[PDB]
Amino acid sequence: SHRKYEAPRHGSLAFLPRKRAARHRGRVKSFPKDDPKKPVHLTAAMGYKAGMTTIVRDLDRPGAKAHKKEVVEAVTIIDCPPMVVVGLVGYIETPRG
Amino acid sequence: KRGAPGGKLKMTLGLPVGAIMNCADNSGARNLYIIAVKGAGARLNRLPAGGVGDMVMATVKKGKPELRKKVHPAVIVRQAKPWKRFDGVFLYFEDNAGVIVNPKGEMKGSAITGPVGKEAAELWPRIASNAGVVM
Amino acid sequence: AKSARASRIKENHQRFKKNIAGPVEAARLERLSAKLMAIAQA
Amino acid sequence: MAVRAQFENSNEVGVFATLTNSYCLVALGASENFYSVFEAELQDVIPICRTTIAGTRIIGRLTAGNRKGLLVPTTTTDQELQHLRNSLPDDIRIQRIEERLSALGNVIVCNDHTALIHPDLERETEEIIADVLGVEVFRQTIADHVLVGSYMALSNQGGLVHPKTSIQDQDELSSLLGVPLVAGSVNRGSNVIGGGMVVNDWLAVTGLDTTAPELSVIESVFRLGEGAGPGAINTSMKNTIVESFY
Amino acid sequence: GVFAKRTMTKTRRRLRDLDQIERDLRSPRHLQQYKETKAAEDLPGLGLYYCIECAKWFESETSLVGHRKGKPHKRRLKQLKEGAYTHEEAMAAIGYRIDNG
Amino acid sequence: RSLFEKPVTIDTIFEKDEMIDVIAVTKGHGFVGVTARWGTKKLPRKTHKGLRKVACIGAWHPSHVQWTVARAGQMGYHHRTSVNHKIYRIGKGDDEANASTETDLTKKKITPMGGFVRYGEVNNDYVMIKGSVPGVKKRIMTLRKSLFTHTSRKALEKVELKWIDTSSEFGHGAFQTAAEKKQFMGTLKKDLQT
Amino acid sequence: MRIENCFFCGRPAWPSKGITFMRNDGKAFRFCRSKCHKNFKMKRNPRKLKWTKAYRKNAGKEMVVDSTLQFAARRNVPVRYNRELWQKTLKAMERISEIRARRERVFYKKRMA
Amino acid sequence: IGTRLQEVMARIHVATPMDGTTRETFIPEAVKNLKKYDKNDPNRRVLARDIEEANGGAGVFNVDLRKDWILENPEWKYDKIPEIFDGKNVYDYIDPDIDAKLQALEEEEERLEKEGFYDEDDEEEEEILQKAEYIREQHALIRNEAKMR
Ligand SMILES: [Zn+2]
């Protein structure tokens, strides 16, 4: 028989399986779509998460209640020493990807 | 128009259904027993809960006998559960209290004892005009 | 409510992307590419 | 010169505005309509400041003053105080006061010559009011209401009080203030006069729900427009008032 | 002995502060405010027997004269003689003052 | 080829007031039951054979456990790609006052008093990101450009910082600088002993 | 923004630090931390707790009568903004801090002779 | 007279002081020279609604709060006013007569240098402290031996 009271399911099936990641370093699954009319640029970077701290921000958000007021927000610090470029990979398009 | 006010930021709700608060006006009631919160959502087993500035439906458990048999809209003006404002300040009052109003927001009473919350005063201009301390 | 997959919401977002956010992103891209070109030519 | 206006579909003008004979204070909103009503009525004659008090928008009930001074409560921040000081000219003295009853617009009502206060203010606060505002200070109630600044609107021309004020109370209050007084309502029968309207010596701004008879009463008592006087109430507008408010 | 000592620090179990008791002793208007925030029919002894220093009601004059000889009342008297902590003393502890012109 | 053997700084790839995406592996929790892994309701007190459980896992056909039913297992250490994170500041390592704002003139660096807990000190360029990011301390993070043109006013907003907290996160730190701490404390016994 | 002070112990209260108790008479009490807040909820006396600036002021272990401590006050009368006034004020705060620190060291030596 | 009729008579009643005096008013002289605002007038005054509609409408246009600031020098209107300096409030130290107090503080400082308020000041004493420290160390060793045994 049917369930007497409706309730949404616990958790999202989009994030299955709930297993350990296959690599410690994160993977860019999708880079931004390339436009040849743009100037050349790099799409990504690395960093190391250092910690979190607190700021006070003077907010300019028209229509919001905290407009022209001070807001306290949590932020995260990422230490970013400059990367070193050491290589170049070429990719071709095939009917298998 | 239902009693849930617009332009309200998220805050910690401290008064679920079944809570008894003090009655902060001079309408003759001494306490308010929450039976419903305006604007509450639907979730299995979850008690509807309100915070400062919210309109609830309340009965009167002690006070004048003519107010004991009716359900009144009320606005929570003070709560004891700590909550955070956008300026980073966590704060709480020493009691839970509200005032009896009509659905349009005008109060039944003529005066408010004690301070009211900033959220309640900003959301209800009649409470802001009947408040002695905005706090 | 109109969903995130609604056609009218998609058209509103496309108009916003074309008319408002686009020039700002283009100018930021020009500045960043100029700086990284300066490094690559240095 | 009485104008109906709203602050985000709200008829409580005195909650969001403060009007004196030398400046105007308006709450900062998401649009410019409430500011522009006052701007259209006051074409740069007196400054209009879009200001915030203690992070709120209820500056009309949190601030009090006249053409000589301005009093802000103790929770006003230094940046809001600096913004008010930079917006107003040096002829106006601005002070932040340490009153326990911080709703200054509710506990104080004043004109350029005299002030009525909530009876429970502190003596040094009374001295600060008499010094900054340059007025005579009295402790009174408006028909057993201690929030005189919310239950009375006062100018140098006259005053409009709570509709349930007795005739003897009106007479003694008018004798104490030196101005003519009348009992009437705003916003279709609301008794919250100070919360419903703001007034100076030549302009009144009421809510949009203020009906035509009470608008005429307001114009007569505050002497707004050509040929306006409080003597029209009991001579020419008496039939209208009896037909409306019976 | 304290009744229900586990939750005596809860906000709903809060008692009156010493500076409020000093202002109640100094000004009858403040004490009148505090007494109109209560109902006289629910108070011990119909509210007629009240100790301001202990900020507490009693069922009878015999009970009030009784607790006056006890050490909690004498503790309250000694604390009031020492003087309660206030914001003025808090500012004077750090050397802070108010400039009103 | 021109970029070979060269250092690329973070501010030449990303810019202040830009939303980016952060890609990282989340905090590991080990083997975790259904109550914390999936957020299921607890069974009543002293329920037989456990209460931090799901009462019925297969109460209907088929004669199988379905893949959509909550089970105990590994929680955390998952790959995540979180989007639309605003960059509030790109601070330079050589700048001795990269935690100073226009209204806070205290010359100080981003590192809290006593250092970041379980990290150390930030002596290089740093990125300030609004909110939280999927990783933990010491973890490598990938910052990526947003795949699409933004649709929010928040992405076009300009961030104006007034103050940055630099007090100790090893406790209830009330001082931003050691000079402020010594000014509040005064003269100590070891100050005369030294 | 500004820097408050803890009601209980007098330590500097920066934004998003501690908690504020709002009393029904109209008084706000700002505490820098849960230690001070819980001592207040237990109704302990800061003048008697030896780790507080109130106790140190009562015991005379803080320099209280000094000309350098008369420069900081809660200004209830605002001043119109003037760039040179703010810059000379900043220079004044720096010099006052140096003078106050060295006078405090002299005070401590006179205590510990 | 009924209660409702008494209320409407109280509404129509106008109270005046018995002395007959009036308060002297403060309407400025530009009010009579003001021209009444008309929506249909092409030469009407441009309002903040008009500026907001031209620059994006409500929720998009960002108002400039420093535009109406009255300062001594008009290029100070868009300054970043300092608030925090080395753990102190700048607004706590803002005082219009700061130069006189600073000079008084300085004159007091060279005065205190003149009568030497900040000046700073035996082998037998050092030897007796070293001997006492050695004796205390011996006492600690004896106590540790006793606690061991
Ligand atoms: Zn503290």
Side-chain angles (χ1 to χ4, degrees), chain A, chain B residues 1-68 70-135, chain C, chain D residues 1-225 227-246, chain E, chain F, chain G, chain H:
Chain A
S1 63
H2 67 280
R3 184 176 179 179
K4 297 296 289 183
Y5 295 111
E6 318 277 344
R9 64 156 281 116
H10 297 283
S12 180
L13 302 169
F15 295 90
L16 282 192
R18 319 267 320 270
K19 62 184 297 183
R20 300 170 190 171
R23 200 180 69 217
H24 193 93
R25 176 179 61 90
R27 163 154 65 113
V28 174
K29 305 267 202 72
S30 303
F31 283 110
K33 182 175 73 175
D34 190 22
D35 188 19
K37 292 177 71 68
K38 298 176 170 179
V40 292
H41 55 287
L42 290 186
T43 44
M46 267 169 268
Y48 294 96
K49 178 172 173 180
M52 294 192 57
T53 184
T54 300
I55 67 155
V56 172
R57 179 185 180 188
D58 218 353
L59 191 58
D60 263 2
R61 183 172 305 161
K65 292 177 71 68
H67 188 35
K68 308 293 189 182
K69 299 175 184 178
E70 294 155 10
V71 286
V72 172
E73 295 160 308
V75 291
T76 313
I77 307 300
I78 297 187
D79 188 1
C80 302
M83 294 182 286
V84 178
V85 172
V86 289
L88 205 65
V89 190
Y91 286 94
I92 61 160
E93 279 170 352
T94 75
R96 293 176 293 172
Chain B
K1 271 189 52 58
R2 288 168 177 174
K8 193 179 203 298
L9 295 179
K10 183 57 184 67
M11 60 171 279
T12 312
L13 315 161
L15 300 173
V17 170
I20 303 191
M21 65 183 73
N22 297 304
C23 199
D25 63 358
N26 62 320
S27 61
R30 305 289 290 131
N31 57 4
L32 297 159
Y33 176 79
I34 302 175
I35 64 177
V37 189
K38 302 290 266 172
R43 180 42 173 121
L44 207 73
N45 300 305
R46 182 163 307 157
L47 304 189
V52 174
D54 270 327
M55 172 166 319
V56 306
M57 297 316 290
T59 56
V60 173
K61 294 298 203 71
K62 67 182 290 294
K64 298 291 180 68
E66 69 275 16
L67 303 169
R68 299 272 288 103
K70 292 177 71 68
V71 179
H72 318 279
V75 173
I76 309 175
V77 297
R78 300 188 294 263
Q79 90 185 14
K81 168 79 186 74
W83 81 93
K84 189 193 63 69
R85 291 167 172 163
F86 63 93
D87 62 358
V89 174
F90 279 88
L91 75 163
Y92 67 104
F93 284 89
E94 66 183 1
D95 76 318
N96 320 293
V99 289
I100 295 181
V101 291
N102 55 40
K104 269 166 65 141
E106 293 83 3
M107 314 168 50
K108 188 173 180 67
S110 66
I112 299 175
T113 78
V116 309
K118 293 219 270 158
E119 293 92 348
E122 284 187 81
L123 287 172
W124 311 99
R126 286 304 178 97
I127 295 174
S129 182
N130 276 302
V133 184
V134 181
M135 175 161 192
Chain C
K2 301 298 286 187
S3 72
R5 287 189 300 281
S7 289
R8 197 176 60 180
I9 301 300
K10 286 174 190 169
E11 281 147 27
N12 290 343
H13 287 346
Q14 283 161 5
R15 286 197 310 272
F16 190 93
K17 286 174 190 193
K18 184 178 184 293
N19 298 326
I20 300 177
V24 176
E25 295 196 356
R28 168 188 294 139
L29 186 57
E30 271 310 322
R31 296 189 294 265
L32 285 162
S33 186
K35 281 174 55 143
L36 184 75
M37 194 72 69
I39 297 170
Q41 296 294 321
Chain D
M1 184 177 177
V3 175
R4 286 186 274 251
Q6 265 176 341
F7 178 83
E8 306 191 4
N9 309 285
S10 184
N11 296 302
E12 310 294 324
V13 173
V15 175
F16 309 104
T18 292
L19 185 59
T20 72
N21 277 337
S22 70
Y23 57 91
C24 188
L25 308 178
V26 290
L28 189 75
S31 67
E32 287 308 292
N33 306 355
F34 189 68
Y35 175 86
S36 293
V37 166
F38 287 93
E39 185 192 8
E41 305 303 320
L42 311 158
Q43 312 174 26
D44 291 331
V45 176
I46 62 176
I48 313 175
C49 180
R50 289 174 278 241
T51 183
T52 299
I53 293 291
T56 76
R57 56 173 203 173
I58 49 174
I59 67 158
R61 315 260 49 79
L62 298 187
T63 53
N66 54 3
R67 88 173 167 83
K68 280 165 280 179
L70 172 60
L71 302 165
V72 291
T74 178
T75 56
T76 309
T77 82
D78 305 343
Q79 279 69 41
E80 302 167 345
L81 202 45
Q82 189 60 66
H83 175 69
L84 279 168
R85 176 73 273 164
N86 289 344
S87 277
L88 300 189
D90 291 331
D91 291 331
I92 313 157
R93 295 173 55 191
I94 305 172
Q95 193 155 342
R96 171 169 62 199
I97 71 180
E98 294 293 328
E99 181 65 26
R100 182 65 60 84
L101 299 165
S102 57
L104 305 188
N106 286 338
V107 302
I108 305 151
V109 55
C110 60
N111 54 23
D112 286 320
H113 305 270
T114 182
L116 308 178
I117 63 165
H118 186 292
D120 279 15
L121 277 71
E122 293 179 353
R123 270 65 200 171
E124 55 277 348
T125 310
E126 177 177 8
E127 298 143 29
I128 288 170
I129 288 163
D131 181 32
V132 178
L133 297 191
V135 291
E136 294 186 20
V137 186
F138 304 92
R139 300 173 185 259
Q140 282 285 351
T141 52
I142 305 299
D144 291 331
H145 286 90
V146 291
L147 296 197
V148 294
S150 77
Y151 287 101
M152 183 177 177
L154 176 64
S155 178
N156 300 329
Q157 315 283 345
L160 178 72
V161 297
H162 193 290
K164 299 298 293 295
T165 309
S166 86
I167 290 183
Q168 306 90 61
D169 275 334
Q170 292 175 39
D171 299 331
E172 61 86 20
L173 199 63
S174 191
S175 301
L176 190 136
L177 298 156
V179 294
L181 303 185
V182 68
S185 60
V186 295
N187 287 323
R188 193 145 65 131
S190 174
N191 42 32
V192 184
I193 308 305
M197 71 159 309
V198 293
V199 59
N200 59 3
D201 274 17
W202 74 97
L203 161 73
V205 177
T206 65
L208 206 65
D209 291 331
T210 297
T211 79
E214 45 195 17
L215 202 74
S216 66
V217 165
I218 284 163
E219 290 208 41
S220 299
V221 70
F222 290 122
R223 294 178 65 88
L224 311 155
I233 281 170
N234 47 4
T235 61
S236 309
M237 278 297 111
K238 182 174 72 68
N239 273 2
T240 299
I241 293 164
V242 167
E243 188 73 29
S244 315
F245 306 116
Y246 187 74
Chain E
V2 185
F3 163 77
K5 200 189 286 186
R6 170 202 296 270
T7 59
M8 65 182 179
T9 44
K10 274 182 167 284
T11 311
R12 65 170 168 89
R13 297 270 313 272
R14 191 193 168 272
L15 306 174
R16 195 155 180 81
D17 280 357
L18 204 64
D19 51 357
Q20 306 181 286
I21 289 153
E22 293 180 353
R23 270 193 298 290
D24 282 327
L25 283 157
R26 207 193 316 93
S27 183
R29 180 67 179 87
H30 197 249
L31 190 66
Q32 183 62 255
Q33 291 161 359
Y34 177 56
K35 289 195 174 182
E36 310 182 293
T37 77
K38 300 294 187 291
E41 69 267 13
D42 291 354
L43 293 173
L46 277 296
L48 304 187
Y49 304 95
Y50 179 73
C51 185
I52 313 177
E53 294 86 356
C54 307
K56 182 174 73 175
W57 286 270
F58 297 89
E59 61 172 39
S60 57
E61 173 89 26
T62 300
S63 179
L64 169 63
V65 168
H67 84 92
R68 281 196 187 107
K69 302 190 280 283
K71 269 179 180 165
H73 190 88
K74 295 170 176 175
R75 182 188 190 175
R76 269 297 170 82
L77 289 179
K78 182 175 174 66
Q79 273 169 344
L80 291 166
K81 185 183 286 185
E82 281 173 343
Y85 196 66
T86 51
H87 275 96
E88 293 83 3
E89 175 172 9
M91 293 182 286
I94 52 176
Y96 200 60
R97 46 163 194 119
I98 300 151
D99 178 16
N100 291 314
Chain F
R1 188 270 299 164
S2 302
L3 274 175
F4 275 181
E5 295 179 18
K6 288 185 178 173
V8 171
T9 50
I10 185 67
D11 55 310
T12 60
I13 307 181
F14 299 107
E15 185 173 313
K16 179 197 176 294
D17 311 332
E18 183 185 9
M19 292 180 183
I20 64 167
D21 310 337
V22 179
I23 301 161
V25 178
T26 54
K27 192 212 269 182
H29 298 99
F31 207 97
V32 171
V34 298
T35 303
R37 203 191 187 211
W38 295 98
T40 62
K41 173 75 56 193
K42 296 175 68 185
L43 300 186
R45 181 200 55 89
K46 211 55 191 190
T47 301
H48 186 55
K49 300 166 185 177
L51 60 91
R52 299 181 62 81
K53 274 174 166 183
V54 167
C56 302
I57 70 172
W60 316 95
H61 278 109
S63 293
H64 283 280
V65 179
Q66 277 164 70
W67 63 288
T68 59
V69 170
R71 307 290 260 157
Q74 165 76 36
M75 190 191 169
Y77 208 74
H78 307 313
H79 183 279
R80 289 296 177 266
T81 302
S82 56
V83 302
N84 296 348
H85 291 297
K86 186 94 161 187
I87 296 182
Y88 273 9
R89 175 168 288 205
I90 299 188
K92 296 311 264 172
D94 54 349
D95 188 19
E96 288 303 285
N98 52 17
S100 177
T101 68
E102 294 293 328
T103 57
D104 182 20
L105 305 179
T106 308
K107 291 174 71 175
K108 59 180 183 174
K109 302 254 288 186
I110 195 56
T111 312
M113 261 171 72
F116 274 107
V117 172
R118 282 182 299 117
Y119 186 73
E121 294 179 37
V122 180
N123 304 135
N124 314 292
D125 302 345
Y126 72 96
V127 180
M128 185 180 288
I129 295 184
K130 180 205 168 53
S132 59
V133 297
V136 298
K137 284 153 167 273
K138 307 191 196 76
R139 189 149 291 162
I140 181 73
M141 321 289 256
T142 306
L143 318 171
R144 193 195 58 185
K145 296 276 192 186
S146 66
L147 304 183
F148 319 105
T149 313
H150 290 272
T151 58
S152 305
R153 299 284 174 176
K154 287 204 197 131
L156 309 159
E157 283 173 14
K158 182 175 73 175
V159 186
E160 179 69 31
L161 303 188
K162 297 183 76 69
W163 171 73
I164 300 159
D165 183 33
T166 50
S167 61
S168 164
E169 55 162 26
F170 202 47
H172 303 270
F175 316 102
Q176 308 294 310
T177 49
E180 179 193 346
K181 185 185 181 182
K182 296 183 290 294
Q183 195 90 24
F184 179 79
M185 293 315 296
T187 314
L188 295 174
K189 175 179 176 178
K190 186 180 289 293
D191 299 342
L192 300 191
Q193 276 184 348
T194 295
Chain G
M1 62 145 272
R2 69 178 284 106
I3 302 165
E4 317 278 354
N5 276 263
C6 176
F7 174 75
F8 209 91
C9 76
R11 281 205 324 177
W14 293 81
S16 80
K17 251 69 171 181
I19 204 171
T20 314
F21 170 51
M22 294 276 150
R23 210 154 70 185
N24 280 355
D25 61 15
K27 297 296 289 183
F29 297 89
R30 173 72 187 275
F31 309 100
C32 64
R33 58 189 172 180
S34 50
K35 166 192 195 179
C36 308
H37 186 223
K38 283 167 192 184
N39 281 296
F40 182 85
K41 290 166 75 70
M42 290 192 303
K43 319 275 191 172
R44 303 223 73 183
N45 205 342
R47 201 194 300 122
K48 282 183 167 293
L49 299 194
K50 304 189 179 189
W51 47 275
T52 64
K53 230 74 175 178
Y55 169 87
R56 293 178 59 82
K57 201 260 180 182
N58 202 60
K61 307 185 166 181
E62 295 275 331
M63 182 179 72
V64 288
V65 64
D66 187 63
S67 70
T68 69
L69 276 81
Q70 287 286 326
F71 289 94
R74 179 167 165 85
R75 313 281 173 171
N76 282 345
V77 185
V79 185
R80 190 169 301 273
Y81 167 71
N82 197 310
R83 188 186 295 183
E84 285 97 9
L85 176 64
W86 264 255
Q87 304 282 315
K88 87 175 62 158
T89 308
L90 288 157
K91 293 187 286 185
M93 311 162 63
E94 184 178 1
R95 179 67 180 271
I96 282 158
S97 288
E98 300 171 358
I99 294 170
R100 180 180 174 176
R102 65 183 294 275
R103 291 190 177 178
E104 203 273 322
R105 173 167 272 263
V106 174
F107 182 85
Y108 190 76
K109 258 167 190 149
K110 293 182 183 293
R111 289 220 298 123
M112 295 296 172
Chain H
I1 303 299
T3 311
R4 185 176 179 179
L5 201 58
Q6 267 147 204
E7 294 293 328
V8 69
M9 294 298 102
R11 291 290 287 259
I12 70 161
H13 167 86
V14 178
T16 50
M18 73 291 291
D19 62 358
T21 61
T22 180
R23 295 285 187 179
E24 70 92 17
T25 72
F26 291 96
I27 305 180
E29 69 275 16
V31 175
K32 65 178 72 66
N33 296 115
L34 277 191
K35 188 268 183 182
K36 182 67 181 294
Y37 184 80
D38 182 31
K39 270 80 64 178
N40 317 320
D41 179 38
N43 290 318
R44 66 185 183 273
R45 170 196 173 94
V46 176
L47 300 175
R49 295 179 66 250
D50 291 331
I51 296 174
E52 180 183 54
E53 206 163 3
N55 296 115
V60 169
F61 164 76
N62 199 0
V63 71
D64 184 23
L65 293 177
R66 285 156 180 249
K67 184 178 184 293
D68 285 353
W69 269 14
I70 307 164
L71 300 184
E72 301 83 335
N73 199 14
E75 57 255 17
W76 300 343
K77 282 175 36 166
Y78 298 99
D79 293 8
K80 300 297 183 178
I81 303 172
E83 303 169 2
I84 305 300
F85 174 56
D86 288 356
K88 294 179 297 294
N89 296 311
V90 182
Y91 280 78
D92 277 2
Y93 287 86
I94 287 292
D95 189 41
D97 46 303
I98 184 64
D99 291 331
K101 294 181 176 67
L102 190 136
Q103 295 298 109
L105 186 73
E106 297 279 355
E107 293 179 354
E108 182 193 7
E109 187 79 1
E110 292 83 4
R111 185 179 67 189
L112 289 181
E113 297 262 23
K114 276 161 190 174
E115 68 273 14
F117 182 80
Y118 305 97
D119 50 9
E120 302 184 2
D121 292 331
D122 198 4
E123 294 293 328
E124 190 261 339
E125 293 189 0
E126 294 293 328
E127 196 205 23
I128 211 71
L129 313 185
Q130 295 297 109
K131 286 158 66 174
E133 280 308 275
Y134 192 87
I135 289 169
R136 288 186 193 98
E137 189 188 18
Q138 294 313 295
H139 282 169
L141 296 182
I142 292 173
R143 289 196 74 174
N144 287 349
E145 182 65 26
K147 288 184 61 177
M148 179 60 65
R149 65 179 177 88

